[PDB]
Symmetry: C2
Subunit: 112 residues, 2 copies
């Protein structure tokens, strides 16, 4: 379910159904890159091709989180990718913020 | 559990704040991230607390970030199209895994998605 249109837009059908894995999502981008080669294109990721997607979207959201808010502390801006990985894998529902100051982080966690 | 297990770089403080050491090093896996949250939930039980995720315990964390997430992305911008607002969790999953530098946005309208994608 990957095409490059004559309009210049890549359309990726992801996920295919109610199964959602990290290896799948990474493989998808691999194929996008293989199809593009050296050129770059906007991309539509169509996650609405089947009602089974939203069955998976509800299950991914149903997974629990006992944190009331989450401060994520790194040592450089690149650690933002690690925060997003964590929040994305875990479908974190609560307030979240990125810091590079532990004192800023801890103070923000006290704002409850 | 009444049984003593593994520290898991996890503590609930007397200040009522959870502190998670994640990632522990330069290795980054989805399973580890999930396991880390499982341990947070098991420790908390019925109660809820603010959490600090300390991703700055070692210089090897950022080095892993760059090593696993610096991969090329041939997409110039990404519109992720769902059916309902809850489908955003899938968008966040995809983008969390793939760590793209380009503009990304969530839609439930295909027309809106395409219009936005064409601001190229």
């Amino acid at each position: 379910g990957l095409t490059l249109g004559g309009d210049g837009i890549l359309r990726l059908t992801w996920p295919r159904g109610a199964a959602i894995t990290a290896a799948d999502a990474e493989r998808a981008m691999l194929r996008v890159n293989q199809l593009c080669g050296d050129d770059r294109h906007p991309m539509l990721v169509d996650m609405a091709t089947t009602a089974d997607v939203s069955r998976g979207a509800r299950a991914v959201f149903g997974r629990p989180c006992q944190a009331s808010r989450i401060a994520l502390l790194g040592s450089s801006p690149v650690d933002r990718v690690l925060a997003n990985f964590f929040l994305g894998i875990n479908a974190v529902p609560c307030p979240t913020k990125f810091f590079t100051s532990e004192r800023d982080a801890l103070t923000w966690l006290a704002l409850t």
